[PDB]
Amino acid sequence: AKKSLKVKQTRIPKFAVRAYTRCQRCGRARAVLSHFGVCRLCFRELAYAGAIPGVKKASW
Amino acid sequence: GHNRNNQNRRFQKPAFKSEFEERIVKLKRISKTTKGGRNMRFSVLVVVGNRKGKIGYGIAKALEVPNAIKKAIKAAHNSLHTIEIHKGSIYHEVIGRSGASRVLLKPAPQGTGIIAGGAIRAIIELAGYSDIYTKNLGRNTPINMIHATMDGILKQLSPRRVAILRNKNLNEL
Amino acid sequence: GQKVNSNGLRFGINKNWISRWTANSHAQTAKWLIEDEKIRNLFFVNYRNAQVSNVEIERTQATVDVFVYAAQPAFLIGSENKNIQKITKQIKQIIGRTTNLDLTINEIGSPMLSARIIARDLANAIEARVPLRTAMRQSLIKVLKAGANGIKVLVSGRLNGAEIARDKMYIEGNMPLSTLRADIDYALEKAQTTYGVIGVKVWINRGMIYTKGLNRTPAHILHPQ
RNA sequence: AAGAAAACUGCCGAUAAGGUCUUCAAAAA
RNA sequence: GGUACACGAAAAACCUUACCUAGACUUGACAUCCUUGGCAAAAUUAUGGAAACAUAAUGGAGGUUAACCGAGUGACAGGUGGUGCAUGGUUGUCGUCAGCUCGUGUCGUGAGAUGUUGGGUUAAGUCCCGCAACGAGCGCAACCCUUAUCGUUAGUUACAUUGUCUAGCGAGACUGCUAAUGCAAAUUGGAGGAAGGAAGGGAUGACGUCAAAUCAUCAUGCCCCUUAUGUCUAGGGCUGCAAACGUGCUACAAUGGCCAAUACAAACAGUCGCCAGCUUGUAAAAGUGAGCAAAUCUGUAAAGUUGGUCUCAGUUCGGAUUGAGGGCUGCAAUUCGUCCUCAUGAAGUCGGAAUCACUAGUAAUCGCGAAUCAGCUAUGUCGCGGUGAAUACGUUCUCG
Ligand SMILES: [Mg+2]
Ligand SMILES: [Mg+2]
Ligand SMILES: [Mg+2]
Ligand SMILES: [Mg+2]
Ligand SMILES: [Mg+2]
Ligand SMILES: [Mg+2]
Ligand SMILES: [Mg+2]
Ligand SMILES: [Mg+2]
Ligand SMILES: [Mg+2]
Ligand SMILES: [Mg+2]
Ligand SMILES: [Mg+2]
Ligand SMILES: [Mg+2]
Ligand SMILES: [Mg+2]
Ligand SMILES: [Mg+2]
Ligand SMILES: [Mg+2]
Ligand SMILES: [Mg+2]
Ligand SMILES: [Mg+2]
Ligand SMILES: [Mg+2]
Ligand SMILES: [Mg+2]
Ligand SMILES: [Mg+2]
Ligand SMILES: [Mg+2]
Ligand SMILES: [Mg+2]
Ligand SMILES: [Mg+2]
Ligand SMILES: [Zn+2]
């Protein structure tokens, strides 16, 4: 039961507090980056391929 | 373009491609032990012979069969000994010794064929010899059989050289 | 042990980003980010007989630009420019009609030294039941003769339909992976076999690029002689 | 100048069964 | 076990949710392919409703079907269902340890040896010598980022006690010079220098081991369900409780508690937000309300300094537990949100056998910010600065 949860999340609920944010590529619910709308483990593939502009490795 | 091409499928399986004349005589699977795991390498025993009087043997080890194959290939190419035949057979009865391996070779009349089996049969075919009586009186390790067989054939004395030295007449009594 | 992704380790130092855009807000930063993945994945999965090596996407507030390099653009182009219009309609539906699309199919130079089509060609051989040793050796020898540095191919999976998974590597030359100045191109593919999934990994070394710039110039894209 | 220099001892037992893993060189336009 | 236990989970009231109880559905809430039309789905108002859902309404953007709205329709969709001992991918561990191999050659009947082991030097299989070995690849090192001095460009939203500061480029440190001893690498000392002999930190982690972890991110072979292991909704559950362990917070106190005044940061973040100021309120907060899309406006720095008080007590320590009244978020706070005020005041006075971390701006400690987030006893996690130590004689023992 993932796709239906994804579809239900896309559909608007009847209460505002009923709305949660899921990853947009896959369907992972937890550990979703609101800054990108992408979960933590999809961010690796996008960051490691150059799809996301400006995302370089950090050295501090 | 018009490369024609009709019926059939792809490259099927033609192959030919050879020279001199050879044949795999054994493919063992040796292995050592390291700090975790087992390094496994294939060992091949190739016998190379032109079937006219030139024959050599080559044993090689490599991580993969193709590699070890061509290694033993070149190996035999390097170490090739020269063989002389009399009427297609071996001149005098001989016992080849190598370690605990003893191979008996005996002259045969023209027609019997190669009565050999195993490493000796490969050697006799690869050397050129036809009629030959053999019996393996010892171990069944292919490398030692090849060693014993080649030792027996290389110590052979020609009917000519003997009398020459011996100060006799060619082959005359 | 585990190694850092070779392409991802060299980003922001010698290699530019495949998508270069600045969004308005964090809501438009997600849409413009998922849509390009769909577009890129579309291009790569289907329309594969063309050997598309890499597709970059360029977007402004409202203008989308696509730069597609391929080895055989005839399949994209089609019969008297047919498939091209067809593929255009797919892209417009994905992003939206309200924008302007500007496809720019560019022919590629030096097709060999690109880890995408090489990995794709390796992966294709495995679905066709071609023996793995022969397939890998033949692709490497043509690649090595083409005039590049060492190539490392790792093909892990249920090799040859086996029930116990293995892995075979084949290095041929100096491939300094820990070095940042090297021009190493990396790509990964999933060979879908009747007995499961095969992972093929290809590292290719295309010389030394002392350039401190991020791409800013065709890499293997350049057409030499 | 011919030196040497010296061991020293507490205690310290065991680890259920059967088990992968090398497929192959025929060789390749 | 190390390599699980503030782990997946960077936010369980509803949602999440995969679980239970119920009320409902069947080419299905989502998808394609096909014959076929589009002259809708929404949203919202009614009635019945726990809500799913039904019966009635405005019949709806548009664009003539583009997308979708459907009918007909069987292939099918679907599974967080099983198998991480079928896998791909990703990762832990030895370990950032210094290793792991190959080509040619030589020796050995052979597994195999050689190089890779000897002597010096390192953090290093780092380098130099020797050497039946000669070379090569991966690892090591450097190239990358940052901090430490300076030059140059620029001067607003920084500075404006005039050259800080910010960020572009560059210079600078190279065992470069010298002394000692070594064949040579190289070691030590000295000089100058902001920086001296990997100047500090980070990214970078070889072949492989543990059938190590994940089919619950995703993908996937195979097996299993198909008016049900699929789907929608309401309520419960993930928050239990005789117990045990792990990781943290608070303490047992005058190196302190309470009150008043007051000085000095860096980094980050911000328009459903940061919220200045003002008014009300014992307070959480409410109202008004500018300013800031940001070097401009906002997010009170605390330890620290001074003064007063407490006088060693289960206390002006310690805050648990319990009762009541308030404030905020949210349909909704009982199961199960947190904050404030009042009331109470458990244990605990340094903790047995045994154990953990740490070699400088480090340990200890004091605040600040960000992520997920409507809100959240996150005391968690990731970061930033203030103060700021002690010790290393040595490898006999101990672990690797
Ligand atoms: Mg799924
Ligand atoms: Mg929520
Ligand atoms: Mg060990
Ligand atoms: Mg005793
Ligand atoms: Mg017993
Ligand atoms: Mg584990
Ligand atoms: Mg729930
Ligand atoms: Mg209409
Ligand atoms: Mg019509
Ligand atoms: Mg496993
Ligand atoms: Mg060694
Ligand atoms: Mg030696
Ligand atoms: Mg040596
Ligand atoms: Mg390094
Ligand atoms: Mg297991
Ligand atoms: Mg499944
Ligand atoms: Mg519910
Ligand atoms: Mg829990
Ligand atoms: Mg100002
Ligand atoms: Mg104030
Ligand atoms: Mg108190
Ligand atoms: Mg409550
Ligand atoms: Mg240390
Ligand atoms: Zn995701």
PDB file of N, CA and C (backbone and C1' of nucleotides) in Angstrom, chain E residues 130-142:
ATOM      1  P     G E 130      72.746  -0.938  -4.889  1.00  0.00           P
ATOM      2  O5'   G E 130      72.628  -2.410  -4.290  1.00  0.00           O
ATOM      3  C5'   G E 130      73.554  -2.875  -3.320  1.00  0.00           C
ATOM      4  C4'   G E 130      72.954  -3.956  -2.460  1.00  0.00           C
ATOM      5  C3'   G E 130      72.466  -5.186  -3.199  1.00  0.00           C
ATOM      6  O3'   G E 130      73.514  -6.078  -3.536  1.00  0.00           O
ATOM      7  C1'   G E 130      70.866  -4.516  -1.586  1.00  0.00           C
ATOM      8  P     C E 131      73.653  -6.623  -5.042  1.00  0.00           P
ATOM      9  O5'   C E 131      72.442  -7.646  -5.205  1.00  0.00           O
ATOM     10  C5'   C E 131      72.296  -8.761  -4.338  1.00  0.00           C
ATOM     11  C4'   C E 131      70.860  -9.215  -4.269  1.00  0.00           C
ATOM     12  C3'   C E 131      70.217  -9.588  -5.598  1.00  0.00           C
ATOM     13  O3'   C E 131      70.500 -10.922  -5.987  1.00  0.00           O
ATOM     14  C1'   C E 131      68.779  -8.138  -4.396  1.00  0.00           C
ATOM     15  P     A E 132      71.276 -11.225  -7.361  1.00  0.00           P
ATOM     16  O5'   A E 132      70.123 -11.628  -8.384  1.00  0.00           O
ATOM     17  C5'   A E 132      69.327 -12.790  -8.170  1.00  0.00           C
ATOM     18  C4'   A E 132      67.876 -12.549  -8.509  1.00  0.00           C
ATOM     19  C3'   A E 132      66.891 -13.551  -7.905  1.00  0.00           C
ATOM     20  O3'   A E 132      65.660 -12.890  -7.619  1.00  0.00           O
ATOM     21  C1'   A E 132      66.713 -13.597 -10.254  1.00  0.00           C
ATOM     22  P     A E 133      65.508 -11.996  -6.293  1.00  0.00           P
ATOM     23  O5'   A E 133      66.138 -10.595  -6.709  1.00  0.00           O
ATOM     24  C5'   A E 133      65.348  -9.586  -7.317  1.00  0.00           C
ATOM     25  C4'   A E 133      65.565  -9.556  -8.808  1.00  0.00           C
ATOM     26  C3'   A E 133      64.895  -8.412  -9.552  1.00  0.00           C
ATOM     27  O3'   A E 133      65.674  -7.229  -9.531  1.00  0.00           O
ATOM     28  C1'   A E 133      64.420 -10.450 -10.653  1.00  0.00           C
ATOM     29  P     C E 134      64.963  -5.791  -9.581  1.00  0.00           P
ATOM     30  O5'   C E 134      64.433  -5.693 -11.078  1.00  0.00           O
ATOM     31  C5'   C E 134      65.340  -5.611 -12.166  1.00  0.00           C
ATOM     32  C4'   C E 134      64.606  -5.491 -13.474  1.00  0.00           C
ATOM     33  C3'   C E 134      63.552  -4.400 -13.527  1.00  0.00           C
ATOM     34  O3'   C E 134      64.104  -3.123 -13.796  1.00  0.00           O
ATOM     35  C1'   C E 134      62.634  -6.409 -14.357  1.00  0.00           C
ATOM     36  P     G E 135      63.343  -1.802 -13.299  1.00  0.00           P
ATOM     37  O5'   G E 135      62.066  -1.733 -14.245  1.00  0.00           O
ATOM     38  C5'   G E 135      60.851  -1.169 -13.787  1.00  0.00           C
ATOM     39  C4'   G E 135      59.689  -1.640 -14.620  1.00  0.00           C
ATOM     40  C3'   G E 135      58.322  -1.154 -14.179  1.00  0.00           C
ATOM     41  O3'   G E 135      58.047   0.165 -14.612  1.00  0.00           O
ATOM     42  C1'   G E 135      58.226  -3.472 -14.593  1.00  0.00           C
ATOM     43  P     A E 136      57.140   1.129 -13.705  1.00  0.00           P
ATOM     44  O5'   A E 136      55.684   0.509 -13.857  1.00  0.00           O
ATOM     45  C5'   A E 136      55.070   0.419 -15.133  1.00  0.00           C
ATOM     46  C4'   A E 136      53.800  -0.383 -15.072  1.00  0.00           C
ATOM     47  C3'   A E 136      52.803   0.070 -14.024  1.00  0.00           C
ATOM     48  O3'   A E 136      52.073   1.218 -14.412  1.00  0.00           O
ATOM     49  C1'   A E 136      53.019  -2.272 -13.928  1.00  0.00           C
ATOM     50  P     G E 137      51.550   2.237 -13.288  1.00  0.00           P
ATOM     51  O5'   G E 137      50.154   1.622 -12.844  1.00  0.00           O
ATOM     52  C5'   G E 137      49.215   1.185 -13.813  1.00  0.00           C
ATOM     53  C4'   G E 137      48.108   0.393 -13.175  1.00  0.00           C
ATOM     54  C3'   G E 137      47.588   0.945 -11.861  1.00  0.00           C
ATOM     55  O3'   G E 137      46.645   1.983 -12.067  1.00  0.00           O
ATOM     56  C1'   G E 137      47.995  -1.364 -11.631  1.00  0.00           C
ATOM     57  P     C E 138      46.511   3.197 -11.022  1.00  0.00           P
ATOM     58  O5'   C E 138      45.726   2.549  -9.801  1.00  0.00           O
ATOM     59  C5'   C E 138      44.473   1.919 -10.014  1.00  0.00           C
ATOM     60  C4'   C E 138      43.961   1.278  -8.752  1.00  0.00           C
ATOM     61  C3'   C E 138      44.172   2.073  -7.480  1.00  0.00           C
ATOM     62  O3'   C E 138      43.224   3.113  -7.315  1.00  0.00           O
ATOM     63  C1'   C E 138      44.827  -0.146  -7.109  1.00  0.00           C
ATOM     64  P     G E 139      43.639   4.465  -6.553  1.00  0.00           P
ATOM     65  O5'   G E 139      44.109   3.956  -5.118  1.00  0.00           O
ATOM     66  C5'   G E 139      43.171   3.723  -4.080  1.00  0.00           C
ATOM     67  C4'   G E 139      43.784   2.923  -2.959  1.00  0.00           C
ATOM     68  C3'   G E 139      44.634   3.686  -1.967  1.00  0.00           C
ATOM     69  O3'   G E 139      43.880   4.475  -1.065  1.00  0.00           O
ATOM     70  C1'   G E 139      45.696   1.663  -2.512  1.00  0.00           C
ATOM     71  P     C E 140      44.297   6.004  -0.809  1.00  0.00           P
ATOM     72  O5'   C E 140      45.798   5.894  -0.292  1.00  0.00           O
ATOM     73  C5'   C E 140      46.092   5.449   1.023  1.00  0.00           C
ATOM     74  C4'   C E 140      47.529   5.730   1.370  1.00  0.00           C
ATOM     75  C3'   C E 140      47.956   7.175   1.195  1.00  0.00           C
ATOM     76  O3'   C E 140      47.585   7.992   2.290  1.00  0.00           O
ATOM     77  C1'   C E 140      49.566   5.750   0.208  1.00  0.00           C
ATOM     78  P     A E 141      46.941   9.442   2.034  1.00  0.00           P
ATOM     79  O5'   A E 141      48.129  10.279   1.388  1.00  0.00           O
ATOM     80  C5'   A E 141      49.239  10.687   2.169  1.00  0.00           C
ATOM     81  C4'   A E 141      50.325  11.280   1.311  1.00  0.00           C
ATOM     82  C3'   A E 141      49.900  12.466   0.460  1.00  0.00           C
ATOM     83  O3'   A E 141      49.992  13.683   1.178  1.00  0.00           O
ATOM     84  C1'   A E 141      51.042  10.885  -0.890  1.00  0.00           C
ATOM     85  P     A E 142      48.764  14.720   1.191  1.00  0.00           P
ATOM     86  O5'   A E 142      48.951  15.567  -0.142  1.00  0.00           O
ATOM     87  C5'   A E 142      50.106  16.370  -0.329  1.00  0.00           C
ATOM     88  C4'   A E 142      50.300  16.724  -1.778  1.00  0.00           C
ATOM     89  C3'   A E 142      49.094  17.353  -2.462  1.00  0.00           C
ATOM     90  O3'   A E 142      49.027  18.755  -2.276  1.00  0.00           O
ATOM     91  C1'   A E 142      49.891  15.559  -3.777  1.00  0.00           C
TER      92        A E 142
END
